[PDB]
Amino acid sequence: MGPVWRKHYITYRINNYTPDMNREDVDYAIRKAFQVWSNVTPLKFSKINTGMADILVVFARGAHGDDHAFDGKGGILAHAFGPGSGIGGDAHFDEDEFWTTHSGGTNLFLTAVHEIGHSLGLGHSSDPKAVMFPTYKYVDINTFRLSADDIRGIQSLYG
Ligand SMILES: NC(=O)CC[C@H](NC(=O)CCc1ccc(-c2cc(-c3ccccc3)cs2)cc1)C(=O)N[C@@H](CCC(=O)O)C(N)=O
Ligand SMILES: [Ca+2]
Ligand SMILES: [Ca+2]
Ligand SMILES: [Ca+2]
Ligand SMILES: [Zn+2]
Ligand SMILES: [Zn+2]
């Protein structure tokens, strides 16, 4: 198996905020994405406001210091690093997308759920109904549930 966090208690911090949304909408979306994987694992996630966090959430564009430049509106929407120190675990969102709480533009909550799965050590899935499938689709946020493949996936890593 790939790398996994060696603790079940895991912290994160939001480095900066997209102008597209209200700041409280960003905190919510992100807290909720974490909630998703917390609900199917022995993992506990604690947001820190200042200091060292295992997971840094970043909004940035084009070339942003990691070797994996983004690409303007469309195309790559976000990427994340598997578990590890430093940039390990970190999740970056392409500021050139228009981030929303709804079905217009790119939904942030949905993208976060996918990216946090990479931050936890997950690959892509070959199942289209899995959040870990390589492409973005909007699904009704109210009724959103992880797929059985996703759960098998995260549970083979932690538990
Ligand atoms: N070159 C590449 O490899 C780019 C791929 C690029 N992906 C990325 O950048 C990856 C980020 C990511 C991946 C997957 C998802 C989602 C999965 C689900 C889902 C939920 C329930 C059931 C089934 C699915 C909801 S959302 C969300 C975010 C992308 O999707 N791009 C869009 C382009 C959008 C546009 O131009 O507007 C696309 N759809 O192809
Ligand atoms: Ca892009
Ligand atoms: Ca990190
Ligand atoms: Ca934007
Ligand atoms: Zn990056
Ligand atoms: Zn991915």
Torsion of CA 133, 139, 142, 144, to 10 degrees: -20
Query: What three-state secondary structure class fits 115?
Result: helix
Residues 89 and 4: their CA atoms lie apart, in Å, by 10
CA of 99 to the centre of ligand 4 (A): 6
CATH number at residue 75: 3.40.390.10
Q: Which two tokens stand for residue 113?
A: 């759920």
Ligand nearest to the CA of 73: 2
Q: State which residues form the domain around 4.
A: 1-159
CA separation (Å) from 105 to 44, 94, 137, 138? 30, 12, 11, 10
| Cβ of 62 less than 6 Å from ligand 1 | no
> Which protein residue has the closest C-alpha to ligand 1 atom 19?
131
List, as one string, the DSSP characters of 94-114.
ETTS-EESSSSSEEHHHHHHH
| Cβ of 133 less than 6 Å from ligand 1 | yes
* DSSP tag of 81: P
Method in brief? X-ray
Q: Is 115 known to be catalytic? A: yes
Residues 100 and 104: their CA atoms lie apart, in Å, by 7
Partnered with residue 44 across adjacent β-strands are 9
Residues 139 and 127: their CA atoms lie apart, in Å, by 15
**Beta strands, E only, 41-152:** 44-47, 55-60, 78-80, 91-94, 99-100, 106-107
Which atom number of ligand 1 is nearest to the Cα of residue 73?
A: 36
* Resolution given for this structure, in angstroms: 2.0
Residue tagged active-site, from 43, 108, 111, 115: 115
